[model samples]
Target: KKLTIGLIGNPNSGKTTLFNQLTGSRQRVGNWAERKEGQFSTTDHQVTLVDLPGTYSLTTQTSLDEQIACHYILSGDADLLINVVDASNLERNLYLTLQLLELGIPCIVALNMLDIAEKQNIRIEIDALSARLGCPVIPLVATDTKNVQFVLKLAIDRYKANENVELVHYAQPLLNEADSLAKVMPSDIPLKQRRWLGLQMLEGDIYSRAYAGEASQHLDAALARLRNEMDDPALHIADARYQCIAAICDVVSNTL
Candidate 1:
């Protein structure tokens, strides 16, 4: 069997270093837009690891590089995404994790930079973080070859197990609106993708609006209702994500 795994995270989260650690001599560094691609074989599967451009959020309103990352993620080409989170900067990096979870892809978190986090007196409870994110959380220094290999082996194991991550829960009103919008989505789309698209459309995402196609009318009505009920539906969604991140940080991290 073959598995396509993508490495993604915020800028400066050490994705490139991890990619190099995983691929070693097999890596082919690419142009500015597209970053790198490499192949390696585990005992059970041939893995194609792609190092995608780093971005804070997957929204299309961001920079060109960020948009490229968003497009690739939404295209469903990669079988699994290894979200490289920076443990030293857990709060900020987790914002992307929330987005990825909402997108409903199969994902595991590579909790990198533990050495730096420890140096800064930031102690993280790895098991707690794994429970919070509802996926495997492997803490490792990107420069360590053994650490990177362990993460790769775990990625393959998790892939074979076919685990599903728990999605983020929004405020009741937003959840209600998203559920309503999702019901109107085309039946061909999977339930998870429908829910994600519903939330995106409610936030007025241009790409999502186009993707909704004939369902835009339902989205427009839902948006109008949500706008009339709340101050800014988009800001509320953003706030909800942060709130989730904040709670996770509170539980799993300690500033010593």
Candidate 2:
């Protein structure tokens, strides 16, 4: 099948830098796509490269740029996501990856700036990180055009593999509540994506709240119960993600 590959990442994560190398564009030039399949310098397969805005969270948008990227991803515009994360700043940058995985889309994480990570004395066990992430994690150096081409090809290969992706898990109480919310969610939420929607509901996210529709009638009660049980649902959720990032880092990195 022809693929719509969406490239997303935090600002200065080398997302645009890799985009330029793979698509052979000198600049963004007011375009979402640099060149079409037959027109690009990379793989022979039919692929449409979409350059999304740089942001930390898909649901927390402060600009039209981030809103655009968030909207497209939630709208199911990208068949496969290229989540570029900075290895040097992997822990903080991984919050975005958690959201993407929850979207229930197939993804390959491009571990950008390996050189920088190396210079910072950060050593990453790519395989261990990949296992923890449940997706392919390919190290990338955007300055090298060859490496960019290789990553693009690997993305296509992984897409063709059609493997199932498991979203990151949280603490028992948080996960139990999310599951309860998901079970009550209306059909408006996508099948595989309900868990994510439910977690967002707990977070009081505008998008999830709006998408919940009539199912939200029970949300206030649910939210109240959750709040009563936990001091801060939002903070708890944030901590869960941070803990996951920390776990991944511990398994993959060396202390300086």
Candidate 3:
């Protein structure tokens, strides 16, 4: 099977710009403005490229952004996720990066807009950030042709290596539910993805609960147990992610 690479990031993160630089003549428009993709090849490889809608988080399905982005991420299409983070807004942008890493998918972080980060006096130690995130982090000015080639080649090499970063951790309370939910989780969900799906079940995401088959029953019990102990499970999950990202940035910053 041809490896599929999906580009994801926040609005104005230069994701589309990177897509244009990569695809050039191989791009096509979809029915929705945000749904765009391209077919292209490296010197020795052919790959399917998909550009997903920009979304800050995968929590909401009622909205257009989250619905499209979430669907694509879970649809078994993307063999690898290319997370484009705005170098200038690393803290906020990494919120989504945390969620992507949780999906147990092979991910490559493209630290885009190095020029802007420099002008803004944001000094990022790329190697340190990569180590902290447990993923490959490549710095690139997507607008620069040579830089684009460099990042793209690195992405391909990483793809060939077939490795996934370690999933980020959450607060013990949030993890408790995910851990319990993992036991009775539906067989349909991949074993590696139980943690993410379990968290979704507690957040009341119907897609996870409804599709879990027999596992949905166990998920319901877990959600009810959580609700009994706490007023809001979803909000707790979100806050935990925020703290996790902060800790990650703090670690990287200290090392630099």
Per-candidate TM equals: 0.88, 0.84, 0.84
Best by TM-score: 1
* Runs with alpha carbons beyond 4 Å of true place in candidate 3: 32-34, 160-168, 171-173, 214-224, 227-232, 253-256
Candidates' lDDT values, in order? 0.79, 0.73, 0.76
Residue 236: error of model 3 in Å?
3.6
Report the error of model 1 at residue 247, Å: 0.5
| Highest lDDT scorer | 1
Off by over 4 Å in 1: 29-35, 160-167, 217-220
Where model 2 places Cα greater than 4 Å from the true spot, the runs are 26-44, 160-168, 171-173, 183-188
Look at candidate 2 and tell me the lDDT of residue 88: 93
lDDT, candidate 2, 54-138, per-residue tens: 8888775365777667777877867778898999998889889877776667888889898899999888889887776777788
> Tens digits of per-residue lDDT for model 3 on 1-256?
3768889999899998888888887987876535677987776567788888888876544667677787678776777888999988888899788777777667888899978888887778888887767778889899998899875655665463324554455657678878677767666767666768778877777667644556667766676777777777788877777777887776654211
Model 1: number of clashes?
Answer: 0
lDDT of 2 at 231: 85
TM-score, cand. 1 vs. native: 0.88
lDDT for predicted candidate 3 compared with the true structure: 0.76
Angstrom error of the Cα, residue 81, model 1: value is 0.9
